[PDB]
Amino acid sequence: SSSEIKIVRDEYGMPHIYANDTWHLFYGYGYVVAQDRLFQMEMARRSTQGTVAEVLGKDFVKFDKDIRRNYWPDAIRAQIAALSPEDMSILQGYADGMNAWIDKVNTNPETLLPKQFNTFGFTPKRWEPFDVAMIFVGTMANRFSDSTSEIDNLALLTALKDKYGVSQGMAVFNQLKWLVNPSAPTTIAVQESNYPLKFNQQNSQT
Amino acid sequence: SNMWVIGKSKAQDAKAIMVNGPQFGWYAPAYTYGIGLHGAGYDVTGNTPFAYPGLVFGHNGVISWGSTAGFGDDVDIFAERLSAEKPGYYLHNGKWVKMLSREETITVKNGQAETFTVWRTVHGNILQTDQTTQTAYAKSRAWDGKELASLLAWTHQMKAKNWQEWTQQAAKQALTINWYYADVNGNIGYVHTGAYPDRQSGHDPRLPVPGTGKWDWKGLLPFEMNPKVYNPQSGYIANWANSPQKDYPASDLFAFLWGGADRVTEIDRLLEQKPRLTADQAWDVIRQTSRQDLNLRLFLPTLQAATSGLTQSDPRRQLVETLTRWDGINLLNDDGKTWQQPGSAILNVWLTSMLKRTVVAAVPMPFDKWYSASGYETTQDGPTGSLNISVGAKILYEAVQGDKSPIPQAVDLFAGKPQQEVVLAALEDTWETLSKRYGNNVSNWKTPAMALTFRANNFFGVPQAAAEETRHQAEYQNRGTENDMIVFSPTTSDRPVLAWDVVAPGQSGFIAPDGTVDKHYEDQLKMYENFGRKSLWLTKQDVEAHKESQEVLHVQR
Numbered sequence: 001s002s003s004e005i006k007i008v009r010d011e012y013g014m015p016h017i018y019a020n021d022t023w024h025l026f027y028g029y030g031y032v033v034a035q036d037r038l039f040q041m042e043m044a045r046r047s048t049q050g051t052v053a054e055v056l057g058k059d060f061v062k063f064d065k066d067i068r069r070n071y072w073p074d075a076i077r078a079q080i081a082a083l084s085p086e087d088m089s090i091l092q093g094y095a096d097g098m099n100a101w102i103d104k105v106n107t108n109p110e111t112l113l114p115k116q117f118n119t120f121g122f123t124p125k126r127w128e129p130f131d132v133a134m135i136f137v138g139t140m141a142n143r144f145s146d147s148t149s150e151i152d153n154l155a156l157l158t159a160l161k162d163k164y165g166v167s168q169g170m171a172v173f174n175q176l177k178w179l180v181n182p183s184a185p186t187t188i189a190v191q192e193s194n195y196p197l198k199f200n201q202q203n204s205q206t
Numbered sequence: 207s208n209m210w211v212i213g214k215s216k217a218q219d220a221k222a223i224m225v226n227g228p229q230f231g232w233y234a235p236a237y238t239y240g241i242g243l244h245g246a247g248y249d250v251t252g253n254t255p256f257a258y259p260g261l262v263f264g265h266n267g268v269i270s271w272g273s274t275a276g277f278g279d280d281v282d283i284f285a286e287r288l289s290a291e292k293p294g295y296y297l298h299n300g301k302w303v304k305m306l307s308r309e310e311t312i313t314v315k316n317g318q319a320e321t322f323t324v325w326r327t328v329h330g331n332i333l334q335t336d337q338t339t340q341t342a343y344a345k346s347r348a349w350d351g352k353e354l355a356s357l358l359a360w361t362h363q364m365k366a367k368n369w370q371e372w373t374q375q376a377a378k379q380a381l382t383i384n385w386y387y388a389d390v391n392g393n394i395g396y397v398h399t400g401a402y403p404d405r406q407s408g409h410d411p412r413l414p415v416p417g418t419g420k421w422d423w424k425g426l427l428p429f430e431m432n433p434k435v436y437n438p439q440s441g442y443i444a445n446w447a448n449s450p451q452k453d454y455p456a457s458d459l460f461a462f463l464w465g466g467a468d469r470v471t472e473i474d475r476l477l478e479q480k481p482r483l484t485a486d487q488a489w490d491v492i493r494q495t496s497r498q499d500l501n502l503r504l505f506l507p508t509l510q511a512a513t514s515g516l517t518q519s520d521p522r523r524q525l526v527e528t529l530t531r532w533d534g535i536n537l538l539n540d541d542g543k544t545w546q547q548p549g550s551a552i553l554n555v556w557l558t559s560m561l562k563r564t565v566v567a568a569v570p571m572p573f574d575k576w577y578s579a580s581g582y583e584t585t586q587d588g589p590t591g592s593l594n595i596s597v598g599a600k601i602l603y604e605a606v607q608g609d610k611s612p613i614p615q616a617v618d619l620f621a622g623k624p625q626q627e628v629v630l631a632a633l634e635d636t637w638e639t640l641s642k643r644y645g646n647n648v649s650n651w652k653t654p655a656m657a658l659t660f661r662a663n664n665f666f667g668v669p670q671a672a673a674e675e676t677r678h679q680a681e682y683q684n685r686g687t688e689n690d691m692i693v694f695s696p697t698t699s700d701r702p703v704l705a706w707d708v709v710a711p712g713q714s715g716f717i718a719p720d721g722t723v724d725k726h727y728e729d730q731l732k733m734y735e736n737f738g739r740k741s742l743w744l745t746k747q748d749v750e751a752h753k754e755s756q757e758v759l760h761v762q763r
């Protein structure tokens with residue numbers, strides 16, 4: 001059946017989804033996620049969108065602000081709007097699947113509502129593709145691929161040049177924060193290849 | 207995070223072995239989510255963080271895949287030129303360009319709502335402001351605008367059936383991530399994926415650049431430039447957040463360095479120790495590396511040289527002999543709270559003192575603090591992530607390596623004094639500190655072991671469970687938040703592939719309204735602790751034979 005989604009959980013409760021098309025497949029995925037991790041995913045959503053203070057109060061206002069200042073919603077929405085129907089079906093199916101279970105949860109909370117929701121004083125709302133995308137953007141991109149300390153770096157360099165002088169200060173900077181170190185153990189052996197690109201280590205942009 | 211992939215030339219009773227240990231910290235419920243997908247071109251099994259549509263850890267019966275953070279430099283800061291007379295504008299290529307801006311309101315439980323404005327330039331979102339010079343910094347990510355493509359690439363790569371199809375997808379993943387590949391034929395591969403900027407000549411990626419236009423990136427580097435290797439001569443691919451490739455530049459983070467001292471060597475050593483490894487031996491590397499003190503190997507030679515001439519009755523001498531007899535593999539005593547050997551405590555105190563005496567001393571305040579950590583610092587709950595060689599230690603390592611170091615020592619970290627003298631002075635500090643606390647009989651020193659905590663707050667510091675759901679493990683283990691292994695063409699199985707993983711505390715985080723915990727709420731917690739693992743199923747026959755429950759849905763879009 002084209003509308004059929006089969007969910008088989010193994011001996012550790014791990015779900016396997018069987019479906020014919022993209023939307024149904026990720027609908028099943030989202031469904032089982034809502035069953036297994038609804039509170040975790042709700043709080044992950046609020047974490048990635050900076051809406052934690054909404055349920056946990058003033059101690060998370062700074063957190064929420066920092067989250068929102070670190071991305072641009074409309075840009076993410078534009079990327080989603082540009083997705084082909086096939087790719088959209090991944091996100092839409094996923095969200096729809098979560099909503100299917102979430103609706104059941106809110107129809108019979110006395111039996112299906114995860115305890116934490118009662119404890120923390122709110123109830124789960126439906127998800128959209130944007131929400132699913134932001135779980136990834138906010139927990140993989142914005143936190144594992146968004147690292148820089150250039151402003152601090154420059155402060156260090158400036159301090160070094162003041163202590164040691166211009167030339168020696170620059171040299172000590174290259175000693176503490178080298179651009180490359182040829183003795184660094186590499187995952188790819190030197191016999192295989194090396195990186196072609198070389199950079200300037202003098203801050204010529206000043 | 208670590209990963210080792212063993213190819214046909216080094217695999218025993220198999221053609222390829224992939225063992226992945228992504229290190230995200232530890233949380234309850236589990237950081238990752240087990241999931242199998244079968245249909246619409248997918249046939250996969252494994253587990254993935256926050257249940258992303260794409261499985262970061264898994265296989266499809268033909269190839270397997272894994273990841274560790276790349277730590278490339280894909281982020282630069284542009285210093286935007288502002289004008290008090292033109293608020294909301296910045297100078298770019300000779301014109302005053304209007305910033306993008308948006309209003310946001312933070313609603314607050316039991317509090318007053320707060321509205322504020324977020325600002326963005328062509329270089330990215332604005333960090334803050336500095337209107338004395340009339341400047342504001344914008345953070346430029348090479349992956350900007352490629353967030354969804356990266357999510358999708360991580361999904362579509364699951365359908366690849368060979369190196370070419372897989373790299374086609376790796377080329378579309380824009381975040382700085384190491385991707386790993388293995389297949390049923392014993393082929394293995396690695397790609398340091400990600401979008402990286404093609405910077406203007408003279409652009410030092412470690413420091414900010416003007417946002418006025420002349421320093422704008424020329425674009426992004428082609429996929430050809432991304433470090434990659436397919437079936438390396440070595441017969442294996444190992445990574446523990448180390449450098450991808452000779453001459454490849456690291457993240458600009460001042461606390462992050464790829465140098466001579468690198469924990470990945472601990473993995474290389476174990477893989478190269480034996481010509482071939484079995485699946486079980488490959489898995490055992492998790493146990494060994496998770497217990498391996500990472501500084502012993504780096505500094506023992508220095509310690510031995512400095513004390514080689516001291517009499518047997520010199521305590522500094524006996525501290526070094528203690529280390530020399532030690533393999534660096536920590537094991538808990540029967541009390542389940544202290545370590546059998548005091549080596550790590552010795553190295554901690556010594557290294558702390560060394561850094562204070564050397565690197566810390568050569569760096570102006572308050573920057574000196576950046577280089578004072580020994581890497582052992584922790585709390586009662588234990589490390590929040592992996593243990594590594596500290597940035598200060600890596601710099602000290604270059605220094606004690608002398609001329610064997612490729613890094614010019616512009617300033618002598620020992621400031622004219624013989625390295626031996628400083629090393630011995632730190633050993634004196636160490637003996638005083640430790641003997642004061644533990645007494646003078648080293649053989650009965652029972653030093654505190656690090657513990658491990660599955661935290662109820664996610665990595666943001668935000669509750670994802672009730673405080674009481676926090677779980678505790680006596681032995682800290684420097685290992686993946688989860689570990690998964692894929693073995694291709696195992697000779698002792700009727701399957702073309704076997705796979706295992708561990709998702710602790712368990713698959714489910716569900717607790718019913720009446721407090722009744724789900725049957726799979728904690729059934730992998732003890733398994734995690736003892737380096738156990740359970741089978742991942744892929745084929746309909748294997749899934750069926752191990753079915754616990756089934757539910758069929760009929761829905762129309």
Ligand SMILES: O=C(O)Cc1ccccc1
Nearest residue numbers: 144207228229273274275
């Ligand atoms: O190495 C890390 O810090 C965590 C990580 C593992 C795999 C992919 C992305 C991030």
Ligand SMILES: [Ca+2]
Nearest residue numbers: 281282411458
């Ligand atoms: Ca940079």
